[PDB]
């Protein structure tokens, strides 16, 4: 029973993207103060929060509203989260609902005893001061409310994408990266959670590499461990989760070769959760998701 | 600890423990497809 909760617009998209990518084994909950945006969620569960406070009109990028929204719907949320062994709280920080409600939600999940992993993006720098300040204030609050908080620096999306990809695609990629963040883990639980729990605190940074071709597993893993989303050196990590995903052509030669590349770069006595998953929808693409915690 | 699940396998343990387990599995399974 692992629930992925998209909170606010940032999460709404991730959860959509996850669903779009047919990420299995999770129950999705899309939570929003904005009834209009929320009705776009492909989630089976759409939880409008702060219905009384925001009247479906959203939090206006006011984290205090998203918060009071979530506090208002404190009972509706626990009902939806009860039974969750693990809750991914995915959200965009900088906003109102994402920034404000996700800590409330994640904290509820954490109190419910679920392994609470927040996976959030920190707004692009370009989103401006308000977005940056609020997320900062917000990411600070996610950290107190989750077991593990994977924070994806959107600004690093811009290093990754072509220098000319339009802003719309830059946001889009943030959503995918958020989806990539949760699928990276959720695909490994579809297993004693105290394994994963021991790997879930402090903040976490993740990296992704995607590659195709003859030397891809290494290409992917090198790109993963070096990826701009992954801002610090993995040797600094106390724990590392590694996800390898590829087509039915994924060979253990490829798998370990990637594992060797991630492993060498991590500390020797590091704790590690490592999985390789086969994605039939892949052909020659391979995706290494690496999440480091420390 | 090594978890087979459909569509994937998850190894838990120290990094070296896994690298080694992967090599062992590298001798007995060609593709992760066949592995599961």
Structure description:
Chain B: One of its GO terms (biological process) is sporulation resulting in formation of a cellular spore. Chain B: It holds the Pfam family MciZ. Chain B: Interacts with FtsZ. Binds to the C-terminal polymerization interface of FtsZ. Binds to FtsZ filaments. The complex is a heterodimer of chains A (294) and B (36). With 294 residues, chain A is α/β, with parallel strands linked by helices. Chain A contains twelve helices and ten strands. Chain A folds into two domains: 1-201, Rossmann fold (3-Layer(aba) Sandwich), CATH 3.40.50; 202-294, 2-Layer Sandwich (60s Ribosomal Protein L30, Chain: A). Chain A has helices spanning 8-20, 35-38, 51-54, 63-72, 74-81, 97-111, 128-145, 157-160, 167-186, 193-199, 217-226, 252-265; strands spanning 2-7, 26-32, 45-48, 86-92, 115-122, 148-153, 203-212, 239-246, 271-278, 285-293. The longest helix of chain A is centred in the middle third of the chain and has 20 residues, at 167-186. The relative contact order of chain A is 0.12. Chain B has one domain. Chain B is 50% helix and 31% strand. Chain B is built from two helices and two strands. Chain B has a two-stranded antiparallel sheet with strand order 1-2. The chains are: A alpha/beta (294), B alpha+beta (36). The A-B interface holds A 24, 187-192, 195, 240, 245-246, 248-253, 255-256, 259-260, 263, 266-280 and B 1, 3, 5-16, 18-19, 22-23, 25-26, 29-33, 35-36.
